[PDB]
Scaffold this active site. Structure first.
Site, short mmCIF file in Angstrom:
data_model
loop_
_atom_site.label_atom_id
_atom_site.label_comp_id
_atom_site.label_asym_id
_atom_site.label_seq_id
_atom_site.Cartn_x
_atom_site.Cartn_y
_atom_site.Cartn_z
N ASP A 43 49.86 25.45 41.21
CA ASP A 43 50.03 26.56 40.92
C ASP A 43 50.86 27.51 42.00
O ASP A 43 50.50 28.75 41.93
CB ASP A 43 49.05 27.48 40.32
CG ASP A 43 49.08 28.46 39.66
OD1 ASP A 43 48.28 29.45 39.29
OD2 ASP A 43 50.19 28.86 39.02
N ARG A 86 52.74 35.32 43.10
CA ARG A 86 51.45 36.06 42.84
C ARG A 86 50.37 35.16 43.21
O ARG A 86 49.12 35.68 43.34
CB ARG A 86 51.40 35.84 41.18
CG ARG A 86 51.38 34.72 40.91
CD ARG A 86 51.26 34.46 39.35
NE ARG A 86 51.06 33.03 38.90
CZ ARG A 86 52.31 32.38 38.61
NH1 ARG A 86 53.21 32.90 38.70
NH2 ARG A 86 51.97 30.87 38.13
N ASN A 87 50.52 34.01 43.64
CA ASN A 87 49.36 33.09 44.12
C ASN A 87 49.38 33.18 45.86
O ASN A 87 48.49 32.52 46.47
CB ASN A 87 49.09 31.84 43.70
CG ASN A 87 48.69 31.89 42.14
OD1 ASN A 87 49.11 30.97 41.44
ND2 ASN A 87 47.90 32.90 42.00
N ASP A 135 44.38 31.25 45.42
CA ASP A 135 43.89 30.59 43.88
C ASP A 135 44.07 29.25 43.93
O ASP A 135 45.09 28.44 43.10
CB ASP A 135 44.85 31.30 43.02
CG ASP A 135 44.49 32.87 42.92
OD1 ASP A 135 45.35 33.47 42.33
OD2 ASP A 135 43.59 33.36 43.46
#
Lengths: 286, 287
Positions: free
Chosen positions: B148, B152-153, B166
């Site tokens: 992922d 944003r992570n 994350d």
């Protein structure tokens, strides 16, 4: 990738996307104008589509929600499907619009200023309307599974409509006993048998209707306050149940309690709830 | 839930603070942990805490558990959000991880775009990319696939240190159900390697594909990947060899690196070890 369904397909050129609706955590919903979705007049609708960082599952999920909604006849207290744009472009699922937003925030917004406060009758009527919506849903072999104030929308004229059929299923589309069954259902609105026995019936929904009721009469309160989900079921097994909301009649509280009966068959049916609520509603009017 | 002494942290030595993030798929709050650093038994350390939302599902719980267990397997690294502790007995599950004062990279970058707010220099962007390449190199050496990878992570500390976060979808390389129709079904498609969907496999080379998208995000200062292209019709375009254009403020050399990362053949894409080397080479000349 997607088959066309003539009796639901709607021309994209006949659709004008407006401003977003909701927080947009699990999808992208926007207000829109649909020309001739009703014959040459524009109708304000809501369109469900994928977010920019959507997964493959988000797609098949949305497709399933659309297919489930196709199997649900028109009803006053249900956000119904109006059409969809499935060919050459993103998937647009067009459903009825409700200007007041979800019930949870709607209820919290008119709490005592200590908007126009909710009258006791309004709360009963609200409950009554959603009970009717569920009675019809159950008659349609449909289990919603995600009943909650957040999943109910309110129209400009305060009509209560059940929404979010992402987790909803036909009665026969549930693998009984499979360890993964009901694993995606919010725990605080979930009937115990859903987890312990891995099954789901209309009576499971009435349990959820009970929590929704509690949310309604607390004017948007959060269920089992101070109790984390990882500890909820041990307590329920020990007989624990939420307390009577302030200003709530004992009669309505006992109704919530009946919905939270350990034994599914001993809980009332949506038909019985509709009948008792109609009575209470009429008595208040008189 | 099992007892793991090495990580258990006393609930009374923790003071939950204000919410962090948006709070869509979980609840993360800022907090003060007294004595989380064993060498300072009486010192309060600001940490981040992951727990379940009020309306969490059973699956949310088992995912948070899994996420915790994976973080236990990942050794401490400068460019990685590391596990600090966990409250697992008599009460809600709390996964205590490192705090990053400045938030996720995406927002961090968008906030430094020309009209706290000091524009990013080319060197800054390359440095940022290098720190993340290093994190993934280490992660790969730990037999872990993130799956992922995205701006944003990534979180950035008070000293602008880039940290991969994350690990909710992360897996040990040998813990993937190859060829199963459900594999990779929860991964954001615009960051997904083609084979993850078409073959249902996931290797480290799949992560470098994602790293490539992460690179594009960085050099576009928080740009949205494949602008205007709905996920529904993205993979068709990818098969045809479609790839994103070069970001205005990115050098040809760094773009060629992005393109390598998006090579159709997984084994023909570079490894994080090599990315680190070339990025190290490029960062040195620049600085």
């Amino acid at each position: 990738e997607l088959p066309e369904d003539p009796k639901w397909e709607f021309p994209r050129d006949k659709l004008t996307l407006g401003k977003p609706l909701g927080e947009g955590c699990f999808g992208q919903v926007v207000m829109a104008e649909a020309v001739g979705i009703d014959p040459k007049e524009a109708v304000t609708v809501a369109v469900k589509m994928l977010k920019d960082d959507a997964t493959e599952k988000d797609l098949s999920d949305l497709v399933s929600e659309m297919e489930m909604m196709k199997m649900i006849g028109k009803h006053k207290n249900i956000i119904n499907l109006l059409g969809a744009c499935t060919q050459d472009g993103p998937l647009y699922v067009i459903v009825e619009y409700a200007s007041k937003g979800n019930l949870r925030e709607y209820l919290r917004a008119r709490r005592p200023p200590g908007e126009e406060q909710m009258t006791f009758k309004d709360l009963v009527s609200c409950t009554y309307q959603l009970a009717r919506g569920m009675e019809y849903l159950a008659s349609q072999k449909c289990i919603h599974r995600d009943l909650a104030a957040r999943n109910v929308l309110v129209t400009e004229n305060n009509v209560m409509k059940i929404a979010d059929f992402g987790l909803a299923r036909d009665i026969n589309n549930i693998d009984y006993y499979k360890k993964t069954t009901n694993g995606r259902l919010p725990v605080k609105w979930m009937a115990p048998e859903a987890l312990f026995d891995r099954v789901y019936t209309h009576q499971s929904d009435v349990w959820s209707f009970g929590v929704l009721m509690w949310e309604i009469f607390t004017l948007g309160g959060s269920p089992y306050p101070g109790i984390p989900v990882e500890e909820l079921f041990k307590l329920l097994k020990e007989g624990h149940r939420m307390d009577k909301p302030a200003n709530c009649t004992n009669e309505l509280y006992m109704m919530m309690r009946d919905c939270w009966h350990a034994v599914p068959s001993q809980r009332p049916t949506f038909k019985q709830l509709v009948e008792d609520l109609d009575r209470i509603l009429t008595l208040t009017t008189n």
